[PDB]
Each structure stands twice: as C-alpha cells, then as structure tokens.
Amino acid sequence: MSEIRKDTLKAILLELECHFTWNLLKEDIDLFEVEDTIGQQLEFLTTKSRLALYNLLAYVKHLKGQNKDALECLEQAEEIIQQEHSDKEEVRSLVTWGNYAWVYYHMDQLEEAQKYTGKIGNVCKKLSSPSNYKLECPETDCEKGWALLKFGGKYYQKAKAAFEKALEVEPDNPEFNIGYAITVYRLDDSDREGSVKSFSLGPLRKAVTLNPDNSYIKVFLALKLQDVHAEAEGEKYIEEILDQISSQPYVLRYAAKFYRRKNSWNKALELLKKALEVTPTSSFLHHQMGLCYRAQMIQIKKATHNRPKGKDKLKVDELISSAIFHFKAAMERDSMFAFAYTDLANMYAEGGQYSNAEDIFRKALRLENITDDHKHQIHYHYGRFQEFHRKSENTAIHHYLEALKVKDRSPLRTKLTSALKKLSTKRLCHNALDVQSLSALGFVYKLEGEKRQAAEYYEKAQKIDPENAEFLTALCELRLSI
Ligand code: NA
Q1: 409 shares a domain with 427
Q2: Which chain positions carry the site (Interaction with PPP-RNA)?
Q3: Would you say the C-alpha torsion 371, 374, 380, 385 has a positive or negative sign?
Q4: Which residues touch 114 (CB under 8 Å, ≥6 apart)?
Q5: How far is the CA of 458 from the centre of ligand 1 (A)?
Q6: Which of 204, 19, 185 is nearest to 102 (CA)?
Q7: Torsion over CA of 30, 32, 33 and 34, rounded to 10 degrees?
Q8: If you measure from the C-alpha of residue 122 to the centroid of ligand 1, how many angstroms do you get, rounded to a whole number?
C-alpha cells in the first residue's frame, strides 16, 4: 500500500462490528478446545447458526496464527450466506466482510483489506446507517452474544446485554430468546452469593414455546425445573426429549446431568457413553463421567462408614481410578476448565496420590484468566487439602484467607470463616504470639462487621510486626469505615 492509506485503514478497521472489535481475548480460552468444539457444533448442534459458527471459527483460526485457514472459514461463511441468507445477502455479509478485512490486514494484504471495508461502507450507506462502517442489527447482536458466551464466564454479563439488545428490537424472535435464556441460565449458576438462582425459568419457558421442535433449549428448562423442586415435571420433559431425538451429544449430556442429580448414575452413564461415541474428546462428557463415578464411590464410602472392605474396597478403588481418568481427560482437553483441575486434584487426594494432587492444584492456582469465583473455589479446595490431607494448618489458613479475599460472599463464606476461626484459635492456644493466626482472626472479624474486635486482633499482630503494611492498611480501613 502506502502509509496513511494504511493509517486510515487501521482507523476504519476499529470502527467495524466483527470479532476483532468485540474484545474476545485469546488468553481467556483454550484455543484448541474452542476450535474443536466449534467444529463439533457444526456437525452435531445443527440448530445453531452455521454462518455465526464459521465466522467465529475463522477468528479462532486467526488466533492460532492460521490466517490462511481463517480465510477458508470465511469463504465457507460466504457460501452459507448464499445458501441460507440469499434474500439478505448484503446485510448478512457485514461480519464476514469485517473479519476478512482484519485477516487480510494481519497478512499485510492492505489493498485486499480496503476492498472489504469499501463493501461494508457501501452497504451501511445504502441502509441509512448513522455510522460509516457499522450497522445496528439484531442479528449481529445475537451473533456477538454467542461469540461472547464462547469466550467464557468473564463475558457472560456482556453476552446478556448483547442478547438484550437484540430482544429490544425483536422480543419474540425464536433464535434471540434461545440465546438470552441460555445466557441467563448460565448466570443462574455464575457468581453465586448463596443459593440456586432461577431467573432463567421464565426466559426458558418462552424460548421453549418459541422453539417447539428444539430439544436443545428444552433440556435446560428440564434442568431448571429440577433446580426449583419440580423434578417430576422436568423429568417428563427429559423423557419426551429422549423420545424425539437420539445420539445428539449436546442434548444427551444434559439429560445425563439431570439423571445424575437424582442419583440415577447408571442411566447418566448410559447417556454419556452414547454421547461419547459421537464426540469422544469432549471435556464436558469426560467431566460428567467423572462426576458419575465419584458419586457412586461416595455412596459406597457412606454406606460402609468410610471403611469399605473386600469387594467394596475393590469397587471404591476402581471408581477412584475411573474418576481420575475422566477428570484428567477433561482437563487435558480444556486447559481453562477450572473445575476439571479441582475435581481431578481432589480425587487424587482421595486416592492418597498427594504428589499428583499437588501438581494439579499448583497448575490450578496459576490459572490467571479464569473468573474470581473459580479462583475462590480453587483456594478453598487447596485449603481443605492442606488442612485434612497434609495436616498443614498454616498453609490451609493462608489459602482460606486468599479465598475470602478474592470473593467474600459465596456459598463457601461460612465454611471459610468458621474453619479460619477454628484453626486460628487452636494455634493461638499453643502460641499466643502467632502472627498469622492473629491476622486471620482480625480479617474474619473485619469481614463479619465486628470492627472493634477486628482492630484488637490487628493491634496484637501489629504489636509483634510493627512495620507490617497489611496490618497498617487494615487498621486505617477500620478507623475510616462509615
Ligand atoms: Na467447552
């Protein structure tokens, strides 16, 4: 090209609406997992927009440094536009064209990139857009919503807003309602301060009514009914779904979750195995298998008062071995799957494989780009491992504190404060000058709103370690609290 035809192009590129401008960061996902599962959905979730899936795959290919392959994906997108969006060819091409411009930009084919921005600017003008190189569009809001969801729990609020934007235009659009309801469904399980949420129940009912032939949306409704103690109603939906479809991994896997949660583990395993025939590498399926084996194992341990003998013991050890295999497989398929790490590590611990559990816990504690909620739970589980398996009370205290610092309102809050109190009190009976324990009690009382008692503990800790910066800050906060 030339400089400043370039410098102008870069400005335009930033004005586009497409994946490159939606702040989808590669560090937040396992690129191989995301790439692989997009392909699986193209094959096995046939109700999801192929156009959106190929646009997204193209972006992911670019993120792997495979710009040449990104182009082939966008060509597939263009074919789908003719196949399924012929009547709206131009407006449906904007995201694809945007991705094209950015990919050609990254390949240093600036002239080619400018061709695409030109086509975009053209269509926007034709359609009376208030912006030069983008166009407000419910369809695009929906695509963005799904792209956001795919980048993980950090994006769920942004995804909800994106679907809301689409529903503002078409409140009764079948596709828009599915996206919204699923987003709200996931948020019901995200960042819980407490008990089960069911804000998705209404949206799910609507989405289901608007999509009467869609077994994928229906399975979430069944799960939500289970959550709200309408298990019998939800189970009838499951039965009806399983009559209408077969072998669909994105439906079976959720039916299997439903059955597991009412302790029908053999049925769950049956469904999961059927799904695995179709998609053997799915981290979701492997995690679910692990959960099933874990539950069966726990039932036996409980029945035999944690002292299984003979064949019960042989069975427990097989289940531990099988749970490990599947948790490990899930973790190896998806490096960002926090619960796969913690579930694997906990099972290693259960089996007395402490070196293996420590290795996994270490990796889990170094995951930077997961949600604070997940970091919170990792600290909690490492803490318990330290407390009950390593018998290392000060390491446990450290991680219980880290858990509360990352997230201080969650369903683990009282387990965390009560364990800290117990441990710190015990240690202070042995050594009244134990600074960590004094500091821990200061932290917990501060958290509980007992300002005066907290200040007393921090003052005792500061008396011993006068230059401590954490203790000075805590005391200032306590003095200045309104
Ligand atoms: Na996934």
Answers
A1: yes
A2: 33, 37, 41, 150, 186, 250
A3: negative
A4: 1, 5, 9, 101
A5: 44
A6: 19
A7: 80
A8: 37
